[PDB]
Amino acid sequence: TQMLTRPDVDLVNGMFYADGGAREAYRWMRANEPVFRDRNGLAAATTYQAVLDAERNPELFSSTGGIRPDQPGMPYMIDMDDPQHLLRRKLVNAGFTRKRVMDKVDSIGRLCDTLIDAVCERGECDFVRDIAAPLPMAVIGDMLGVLPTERDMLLKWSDDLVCGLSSHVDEAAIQKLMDTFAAYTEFTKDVITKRRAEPTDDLFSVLVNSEVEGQRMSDDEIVFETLLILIGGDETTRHTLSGGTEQLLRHRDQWDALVADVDLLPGAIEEMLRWTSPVKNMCRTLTADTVFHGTELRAGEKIMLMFESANFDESVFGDPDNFRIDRNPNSHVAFGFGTHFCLGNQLARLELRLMTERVLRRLPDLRLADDAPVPLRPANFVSGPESMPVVFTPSAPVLAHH
């Protein structure tokens, strides 16, 4: 005897996150079955409170089963629980100190200018393809100290490892994934061996030299953690930049306020993060039977923490369906919460701030080419704008390197 208006959905179907019906479905779930089971019985924590409770209780909600719903865990920190997680995190954190992040201000700002220079004379571009997508990848490659060509191979390997993991059933699809993993590891071990012998100041060198409680990372460990960073740092930042900007463009009074006053921008960045929630879910595995916010969960099953749904929880935000750059407080969970809280959160905030500040200054009349909805990427994990045609009065490039 299900209810007439119960959403009939498959939360691992990428279309659910792209076709525009997600927020409606979440409203139904938060109001009627806050820990919701989809058409395949898959459990999902949909309220902010259920998400936080699960985040604060990794003893009961484990990450070691893997954070995707139909794959096992990988050997990197997001698929580990404390105490192993904490040590691995503290090791890798050497690369993400406040000082290491803040010292990238010049280089990231310089990248931002070159990307804008590439479109500013034209008076139109695709914001995704031409500004949002290149930026996070270029920051990563510069962080790793690699060439742009190397950066391109790496970020494509890491794409293919993502695809082949989510789909490895045919014997050819298995061999292809194993080949990709071999080529990834071989390239990355080579770079590591080089950094051991002739240190630089890049992330590889930092991981090689990191030491916590007498322990250091092995080469295999750096290979996996580097992978996690290639995967975790790229598309998410892209989608906040593009989806976040999209909302600024649709709220002209807010856009104008930000053009007139750059001190409003940190608050805007937090609203962009909440609104876009690029990571749609992370899984946890039940370590015991428990009744959780009304739903009986069994040991061994996975539950999806639905961060977008949490970030639109009216019981916490009051008016989450209104986009507001002045929202304060804004305790959104776009980066999760708790021991796994996004390691790259400060760097992501920096990239968003440095690029948006320059978008505001250099393209001050920016608008959507047309007000229709922006297409989103059908994906069940990280999703945001596929393309976003924009227009602006052209201006002359800065061409900093001359």
Ligand X SMILES: OC[C@H]1O[C@H]2O[C@H]3[C@H](O)[C@@H](O)[C@@H](O[C@H]4[C@H](O)[C@@H](O)[C@@H](O[C@H]5[C@H](O)[C@@H](O)[C@@H](O[C@H]6[C@H](O)[C@@H](O)[C@@H](O[C@H]7[C@H](O)[C@@H](O)[C@@H](O[C@H]8[C@H](O)[C@@H](O)[C@H](O[C@H]1[C@H](O)[C@H]2O)O[C@@H]8CO)O[C@@H]7CO)O[C@@H]6CO)O[C@@H]5CO)O[C@@H]4CO)O[C@@H]3CO
Ligand Y SMILES: OC[C@H]1O[C@@H]2O[C@H]3[C@H](O)[C@@H](O)[C@@H](O[C@H]4[C@H](O)[C@@H](O)[C@H](O[C@H]5[C@H](O)[C@@H](O)[C@@H](O[C@H]6[C@H](O)[C@@H](O)[C@@H](O[C@H]7[C@H](O)[C@@H](O)[C@@H](O[C@H]8[C@H](O)[C@@H](O)[C@@H](O[C@H]1[C@H](O)[C@@H]2O)O[C@@H]8CO)O[C@@H]7CO)O[C@@H]6CO)O[C@@H]5CO)O[C@@H]4CO)O[C@@H]3CO
* 178 near ligand X, rule: CB under 6 A: yes
Residue type for position 44: A
343 binds ligand HEM (CB under 6 A): yes
| Residue owning tokens 């460990």 | 221
Nearest to ligand Y by Cβ — which residue?
A: 220
- Does residue 179 interact with ligand Y by CB under 6 A? no
Q: What's the closest the beta carbon of residue 99 comes to ligand HEM, in angstroms?
A: 16
Asked if 134 interacts with ligand Y (CB under 6 A), we say: no
Q: Is 120 annotated as a binding residue?
A: no
CB closer to ligand HEM out of 34 and 336: 336
How far apart are CB 299 and ligand Y at their closest, in Å? 22
By CB under 8 A, tell whether 149 contacts a second copy. Answer: no
Which residues, 320 to 339, sit near a second copy by CB under 8 A? 321-322, 324-326
Q: Which of residues 215-274 bind ligand Y (CB under 6 A)?
A: 220, 223
Binder of ligand X out of 70, 103, 190, 220 (CB under 6 A)? 220
163 belongs to the binding site for ligand Y (CB under 6 A): no
- State how far the Cα of 195 lies from the Cα of 210, in Å rounded to an integer: 13
DSSP β-bridge partners for residue 37: 43
CB of 395 to ligand HEM, least distance (A): 28
d(CA 292, CA 312) in angstroms, rounded, equals 20
How does DSSP classify residue 283?
E
Burial of 322 (0-12, 13-18, 19+ CB in 10 A): exposed
Interaction of residue 4 with a second copy, rule CB under 8 A: yes
75 touches ligand Y by CB under 6 A = yes
Largest CA distance in the chain: 71
Spell out the alpha helix ranges (H) of 198-332: 203-209, 219-232, 235-250, 252-260, 265-276, 307-311, 314-317
> In terms of CB distance, is 221 or 386 closer to ligand X?
221
For tokens 């322990």, name the residue. 215
Q: How far is the CB of 359 from ligand HEM (least distance, A)?
A: 16
d(CA 101, CA 99): 5
Least Cα distance to 362 among 325, 389, 399 occurs for 399
Binds ligand HEM (CB under 6 A): choice among 34, 278, 320, 384: 278
What is residue 14's DSSP assignment?
A: G
For the chain, what is the radius of gyration of the CA atoms? 21
Task: Provide the binding-site residues for ligand HEM, judged by CB under 6 A.
Answer: 55, 77-78, 89, 228-229, 232-233, 236-237, 240, 278-279, 282, 307, 334-338, 340-344, 347-348
Q: Which residues of this protein are in contact with ligand Y, per CB under 6 A? A: 75, 178, 181-182, 185, 220, 223
